[PDB]
Design an enzyme around this catalytic site. Structure first.
Site, PDB file in Angstrom:
ATOM      1  N   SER B 550      -3.777  39.422  -0.834  1.00 29.99           N
ATOM      2  CA  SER B 550      -3.442  38.315   0.122  1.00 29.99           C
ATOM      3  C   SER B 550      -2.315  38.702   1.125  1.00 29.99           C
ATOM      4  CB  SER B 550      -3.200  37.081  -0.702  1.00 29.99           C
ATOM      5  OG  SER B 550      -3.158  35.929   0.080  1.00 29.99           O
ATOM      6  N   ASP B 638     -14.128  32.794  -0.585  1.00 31.65           N
ATOM      7  CA  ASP B 638     -12.715  32.480  -0.416  1.00 31.65           C
ATOM      8  C   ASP B 638     -12.534  31.574   0.798  1.00 31.65           C
ATOM      9  OD1 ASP B 638      -9.985  32.369  -0.110  1.00 31.65           O
ATOM     10  OD2 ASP B 638      -9.662  34.513  -0.426  1.00 31.65           O
ATOM     11  N   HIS B 670     -10.583  33.566  -3.883  1.00 29.83           N
ATOM     12  CA  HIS B 670      -9.450  34.450  -3.622  1.00 29.83           C
ATOM     13  C   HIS B 670      -8.961  35.151  -4.883  1.00 29.83           C
ATOM     14  CE1 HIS B 670      -6.679  31.475  -5.385  1.00 29.83           C
ATOM     15  NE2 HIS B 670      -5.802  32.461  -5.392  1.00 29.83           N
TER      16      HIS B 670
HETATM   17  C1  LIG Z   1      -2.165  35.018  -0.087  1.00 32.53           C
HETATM   18  O1  LIG Z   1      -1.102  35.348  -0.468  1.00 32.53           O
HETATM   19  C2  LIG Z   1      -2.408  33.586   0.290  1.00 32.53           C
HETATM   20  C3  LIG Z   1      -1.957  32.472  -0.616  1.00 32.53           C
HETATM   21  N1  LIG Z   1      -0.684  32.698  -1.212  1.00 32.53           N
HETATM   22  C4  LIG Z   1      -0.734  32.990  -2.510  1.00 32.53           C
HETATM   23  C5  LIG Z   1       0.457  33.249  -3.387  1.00 32.53           C
HETATM   24  O2  LIG Z   1       1.280  32.363  -3.561  1.00 32.53           O
HETATM   25  O3  LIG Z   1       0.596  34.260  -3.889  1.00 32.53           O
HETATM   26  C6  LIG Z   1      -2.173  32.772  -3.002  1.00 32.53           C
HETATM   27  S1  LIG Z   1      -2.244  31.569  -4.485  1.00 32.53           S
HETATM   28  C7  LIG Z   1      -1.080  31.834  -5.851  1.00 32.53           C
HETATM   29  C8  LIG Z   1      -1.016  33.275  -6.192  1.00 32.53           C
HETATM   30  N2  LIG Z   1      -1.469  33.465  -7.564  1.00 32.53           N
HETATM   31  C9  LIG Z   1      -2.052  32.141  -8.037  1.00 32.53           C
HETATM   32  C10 LIG Z   1      -3.561  32.227  -7.956  1.00 32.53           C
HETATM   33  O4  LIG Z   1      -4.034  32.963  -7.120  1.00 32.53           O
HETATM   34  N3  LIG Z   1      -4.321  31.490  -8.777  1.00 32.53           N
HETATM   35  C11 LIG Z   1      -3.738  30.579  -9.770  1.00 32.53           C
HETATM   36  C12 LIG Z   1      -5.720  31.565  -8.686  1.00 32.53           C
HETATM   37  C13 LIG Z   1      -1.565  31.043  -7.071  1.00 32.53           C
HETATM   38  C14 LIG Z   1      -2.905  32.209  -1.844  1.00 32.53           C
HETATM   39  C15 LIG Z   1      -4.346  32.762  -1.723  1.00 32.53           C
HETATM   40  C16 LIG Z   1      -1.484  33.471   1.494  1.00 32.53           C
HETATM   41  C17 LIG Z   1      -1.838  34.482   2.602  1.00 32.53           C
HETATM   42  O5  LIG Z   1      -1.622  32.192   2.100  1.00 32.53           O
END
Ligand SMILES: *C(=O)[C@@H]([C@@H]1N=C(C(=O)O)[C@@H](S[C@@H]2CN[C@H](C(=O)N(C)C)C2)[C@@H]1C)[C@@H](C)O
Ligand SMILES: *C(=O)[C@@H]([C@@H]1N=C(C(=O)O)[C@@H](S[C@@H]2CN[C@H](C(=O)N(C)C)C2)[C@@H]1C)[C@@H](C)O
Ligand SMILES: *C(=O)[C@@H]([C@@H]1N=C(C(=O)O)[C@@H](S[C@@H]2CN[C@H](C(=O)N(C)C)C2)[C@@H]1C)[C@@H](C)O
EC number: 3.4.19.1
Lengths: 694, 693, 144, 35
Positions: B550, B638, B670
């Site tokens: 991400s 996603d 995602h």
């Molecule tokens: C990518 O980083 C996008 C969003 N930000 C994220 C983050 O906080 O790391 C993720 S969701 C978060 C990370 N791990 C947990 C998870 O993925 N699950 C519980 C499934 C929650 C999110 C895609 C960013 C670019 O906006």
């Protein structure tokens, strides 16, 4: 009233029943106390999902020496799905589970809070589906706790069509016939013994089983040198095995590698239920010495591993052995049945109209009753370990309840103290009692003189109508336990009479042997005499008497409405036997017709005029023209022990004469009609028929 | 070696993790002893069935009122299937379960019997029940006679214009219903439902404002009404999962009549209300800014009978002592009140650790219960009558379960933990924490003096290294058990996880330093950390690799584009590639505006300056300079990060003839959380790293 | 069908003439067929009596039915036989062939039995028809 | 070809055929109803 009946059924069907229990290992505390856990499995009907659900619960027992100091619960119930078999290890540290999911079959090994191992049996492709019944199935741990042993269907060679297209197997064998073992044994033809090594994960099929036997009920021999099992003969063809104890079989021992197999018992009678003692020095099993009747009195025998001497611990009882014991009539022993000293055994068996618990000393041969005296009740022993027993108890007016106890030392077993773990709420509006009947002089048996029989009467606690029930079998019986339908009828205002006529189990071998050759004459008159005596004694309403029965109980009911057309106002039957002669050629137990008609059975027989006439003279169809009682018939289309065309013939005969009849056909049910939806529908229809026609 | 790697993965993925725990009622003995039961739920991966299995276990604790005298097991584990939610009654005599079997059934258990069952589908009063942690709940009345939950609102029946009828609104079959975003498919508008156990009747409460979505409800004192949280969904919904900056408020509604009253402010975000045991006050979390997706929050208290609101715990700019740096958890434990109805307990990140804290709601003092030591990660599952159940883990020790007693006020630091379930350590992994100070040329114009941290794992020079930045960007790594880093460490790699400026758990200044500077300050922090670590431990400089997902993939692409000679391989998952193109297709459009350095408006229109800035901050601009071999793994379904960003990056690299390997999972989101997909992706990444270094 | 009935009669009464036999859905025991077939009047008429819906079992009639069925000659058979039964047949129940199969198997006569679980009296489905014809041809070419 | 048929009227305005008789609906004694 349909709404009130539905509400009553909803209320009554909620009571659960026990199925299995096991004990955990001992635990000590720094304060000096000692406790252990009890694991129990329950089953219950669910009308919203229309299914039988199974759940587990656990309890805690604090004990000081050979005495219970405290007992309590240890959490809530947890529902389970897909469990076929499960077995704890000898040390209590691991657990083995057979599951179906995905469907595919898996074997799992658990330890504490982790699933240590899983094996996908389908992918390995060494055998077919695993057996999970109580006839052949099993699941056993090695004494080293390194190997597992079970039973599975034999692998069949691959086959293909003559006209298959191949990319740029035996041809013509796709539809070869494989004979199975009968009712409730669909698709089960030939089992085999399988050994799984946990560490490496390799599966092996043992070699050396005689080609003409089906093996089962296996366990590890002392020292883990080999396997002990029971083999059932299947030549020249198989006869129905479920609910019968008269199938020829023997006990065998086979080495792990090499193929040597040795016989450990006689080969002309039936044997079953072997159990190795805790010290690993002797084996106890049940032996039935004649193959004629489908249920009878059996013997308890013992075999010494190191001297190779066989002896009879408990022998046949002609009429009675004291006032508390009448013989052994159970078809199985508890999985854990030895006392800690490896000298005594405990089991449960019918005794007249009760079901009691007995302890037997294998050295002297004395039998002691642990639950003698009182009004009655039904006990069932689930297991024993380190001299701690777990039991279920129930009566006609009290649903099942759970108890634990300690087995006293030799010579004082009658002073056992039971402690309650889970109680049930009674129903004070039902009252039950037992009546004894003495046949009149003109009905005495030519050779067995002086026999008497019994009945069980339930009533609310000439105004009351009555319903009469004879049991199937005919070598079976009723016991004073919790029965859903009789309780519902009693709570709707009826009186219920359950008859144990001569020939029932639990009254001696003479009663067993008095009936054959006299079906349709002796039992019918016994039922009629009981009905007349009860009517004259209690002064019920003679104009509102009804009948209800299944299988042989339906055969008796049809006989009764045909021979006494002015006594009964309504009748309900389920999968009745109507014509023995025509039944012989279509059932899975052809020997039953010959035996009950009064002749010996042998393979390679042939139709004879005399035997066929004898069978025709004993069938209720002969009295069809005299019948005028309204009839409700309920049939299962996939029943294999009693084909559904018997009821169809009876129905056509009655229909051609303008008699009122109501027929229901269940296209996917067997003799039991035990599915929740089918069971509820049949019970509601029967109750409505009875209420409307009386 | 594929076989050795597969065996190692099989061995490592066998360790289970805790998900929930609860306590049973107290039981006395004729001897005077006192004990109670603990119920716990675990989950574990199963590679043979390729699925996540869930089972239950039970334990017994014998205590003397203020201390634990003995603890032990009470049976074997039991697997379960189809359980969505479950809640024990206040008195501990009954249990409520929501199950799927498909239809949905609400069940009530008492001792060894399934007392009641209700078929929700047949009653036809609402749609599917909510089972998530954002809106879902299941609550008992104080009289233990009614149950309260949340379900989707019923939609009117529709049919085609050309239906044939035997001898509903026409044309509404395909009307659009907007849902709440990623991992919230088909969830549009919830409603509060009340079931009466005795009679069997279901009612839908009236009086909820038409412009809010309700959730997280519980019974008010005296069972007179219901207290809930309402999220605004006008003019349209923004992604709610994993965000704490959605506008919402706290409401109270009567059981009958339709009167609804507001209990808090209506311009900020509020969440996680909890009623005290004495039923006199309520605590909750309040976030006063809607800009960042995660930030430092406040703990507030509301008095039921005086109607006075106060701030118990306020924002922390940099630090409050050496043990506390602010509140960063998005939820409180379901049971978090002390027995005296005066103290609260929770867990929160603290720098690179995760600690447990106790707060006095009258004085406002915060006390750390797990201060000192090397580190570790704690999680509090519940507290009842001053008995706490916790999970503990570290990077080299899988999760373990413990219980303890909360000491009286003023001495909470002397708590004695008793072990209920231990895990076997891995002595071949060694971990440590490094502190990094940015050089003078990289100081922030307004926030001067900030430092950041990294976590280094290594076997216990010619050691290769793998670098991992976290997503977010407002998130962080904590010293807990992580499967993939452990697997890499056991294969001979060193692993460096970087918490750059802007991570949670370092004060609000760190949170506010990053916005408007993505792609410049976060890329240089990572590079500085890598350079500092390389020269001190003497690792092999020619075998350094990158791996991130991400926002972590966005940083990795930036790094391989701006420093083409430092890294030999790279693995990314669902990366962000072009912010400007992202804005028009994501479920959280405000994120792109906020991280680029502008404010967000629901009526915004495309502009040249903002688009130019977004293009200037994107890694695609450095695509022509890249020469590192790349493995790219994408999930086709996603919704937070559409999979066309990676496709554009892949097309550029392919047109320039750079070695690239692309994997597409057509049914994954995602997370790529399914067991089969997860195992395949991990194995492919490990093979890529081993082959290319 | 009635043609398999005749073949069983022939191999039972003339044990020397024939060296192979194939039967699909034979009538084996007229007495036991009456209670299960969909045309019970056929049994009465072909045995020489008049059918009536009110008629009940009468041992005199049941004697004629048994004396005219091929099972009576089972012990004299020595010709190899191939049986092909359809499990859903409603005119001729498939237990008829099973009785003959059991009688022959109890005496160690070579027998091969094929059972089609979804087929009726005709065995008309393409797969079943082709398989049955191929098996019959192979049997005849091997045993002659 | 025992019962089935399909026939035109002489006017060619109506069709005639044969079909199974309609059976009244039935339900279980325990079926849950929409509240
Ligand atoms: C990518 O980083 C996008 C969003 N930000 C994220 C983050 O906080 O790391 C993720 S969701 C978060 C990370 N791990 C947990 C998870 O993925 N699950 C519980 C499934 C929650 C999110 C895609 C960013 C670019 O906006
Ligand atoms: C009918 O009675 C036929 C057979 N005899 C029976 C009997 O023993 O009562 C039954 S099986 C037996 C009865 N209840 C149990 C049961 O049905 N299930 C466990 C499903 C076992 C059997 C059909 C008799 C005429 O041969
Ligand atoms: C067998 O012979 C049984 C029945 N008699 C029949 C006959 O007339 O031959 C057959 S039905 C008939 C034969 N070929 C045609 C056919 O089967 N189909 C078109 C499907 C019509 C029937 C099985 C006899 C003992 O009653």
């Amino acid at each position: 009233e349909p709404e009130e009946a539905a509400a009553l059924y909803r209320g009554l069907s909620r009571q659960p029943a026990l199925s299995a229990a096991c004990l955990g290992p001992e635990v000590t505390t720094q304060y000096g106390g000692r406790y252990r856990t009890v694991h129990t499995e329950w089953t219950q009907r669910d009308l919203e999902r229309m299914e039988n659900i199974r759940f587990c619960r656990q309890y805690l027992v604090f004990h000081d020496g050979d005495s219970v100091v405290f007992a309590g619960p240890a959490g809530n119930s947890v529902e389970t799905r897909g469990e076929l078999l499960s077995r704890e290890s000898p040390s209590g540290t691991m657990k083995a589970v057979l599951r179906k999911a995905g469907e595919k079959q898996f074997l799992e090994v658990w330890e504490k809070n982790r699933k240590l191992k899983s094996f996908n049996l389908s992918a390995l492709e060494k055998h077919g589906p695993v057996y999970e019944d109580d006839c052949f199935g099993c699941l056993s741990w090695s004494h080293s706790e390194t190997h597992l042993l079970y039973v599975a269907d034999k692998k069949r060679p691959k086959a293909e069509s003559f006209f298959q297209t191949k990319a740029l197997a035996i041809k013509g064998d796709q539809f070869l016939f494989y004979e199975d073992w009968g009712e409730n044994m669909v698709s089960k033809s030939t089992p085999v013994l399988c050994v799984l090594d946990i560490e490496s994960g390799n599966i092996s099929v043992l070699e050396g089983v005689p080609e003409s036997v089906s093996p089962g009920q296996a366990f590890w021999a002392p020292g883990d040198t080999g396997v002990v099992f029971v083999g059932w003969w299947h030549e020249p063809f198989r006869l129905g095995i479920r609910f019968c104890t008269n199938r020829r079989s023997a006990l065998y021992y086979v080495d792990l590698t090499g193929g040597k197999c040795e016989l450990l018992s006689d080969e002309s009678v039936a044997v079953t239920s072997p159990r190795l003692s805790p010290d690993q020095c002797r084996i106890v099993y049940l032996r039935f010495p004649s193959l004629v009747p489908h249920q009878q009195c059996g013997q308890l025998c013992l075999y010494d591993w190191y001297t190779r001497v066989t002896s009879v611990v408990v022998d046949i009882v002609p009429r009675q052995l004291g006032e508390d014991f009448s013989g052994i009539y159970c078809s199985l022993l508890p999985l854990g049945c030895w006392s800690a000293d490896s000298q005594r055994v405990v089991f449960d068996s019918p005794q007249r109209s009760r079901q009691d618990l007995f302890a037997v000393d294998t050295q002297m041969g004395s039998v002691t009753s642990l639950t003698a005296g009182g009004s009655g009740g039904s006990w069932k022993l689930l297991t024993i370990d380190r001299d701690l027993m777990v039991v279920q108890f129930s009566t006609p007016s009290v649903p099942p309840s759970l108890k634990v106890g300690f087995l006293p030392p030799a010579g004082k077993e009658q002073a056992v103290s039971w402690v309650s773990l889970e109680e049930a709420e009674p129903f004070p509006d039902i009252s039950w009692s037992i009546r004894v009947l003495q046949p009149p002089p003109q009905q005495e048996h030519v050779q067995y003189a002086g026999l008497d029989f019994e009945a069980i009467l339930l009533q609310p606690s000439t105004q009351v109508p009555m319903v009469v029930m004879p049991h199937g079998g005919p070598h079976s019986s009723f016991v004073t336990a919790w029965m859903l339908f009789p309780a519902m009828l009693c709570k709707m205002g009826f009186a219920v009479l359950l008859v144990n006529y001569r020939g029932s189990t639990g009254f001696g071998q003479d009663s067993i042997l008095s009936l054959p050759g006299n079906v349709g004459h002796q039992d019918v008159k016994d039922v009629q005499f009981a009905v007349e005596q009860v009517l004259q004694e209690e002064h019920f309403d003679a104009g509102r008497v009804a009948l209800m029965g299944g299988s042989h109980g339906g055969f008796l009911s049809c006989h009764l409405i045909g021979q006494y057309p002015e006594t009964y106002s309504a009748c309900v039957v389920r999968n009745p036997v109507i014509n023995i002669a025509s039944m012989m050629g279509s059932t899975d137990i052809p020997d039953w017709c010959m035996v009950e008609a009064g002749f010996s059975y042998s393979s390679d027989c042939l139709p004879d005029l005399s035997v066929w006439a004898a069978m025709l003279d004993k069938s209720p169809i002969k009295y069809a023209p005299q019948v005028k009682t309204p009839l409700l018939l309920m049939l299962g289309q996939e029943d294999r022990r009693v084909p559904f065309k018997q009821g169809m013939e009876y129905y056509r005969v009655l229909k051609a004469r303008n008699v009122p009849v109501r027929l229901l056909l269940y296209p996917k049910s067997t003799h039991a009609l035990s599915e929740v939806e089918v069971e509820s529908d049949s019970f509601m229809n029967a109750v409505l028929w009875l209420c409307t026609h009386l």
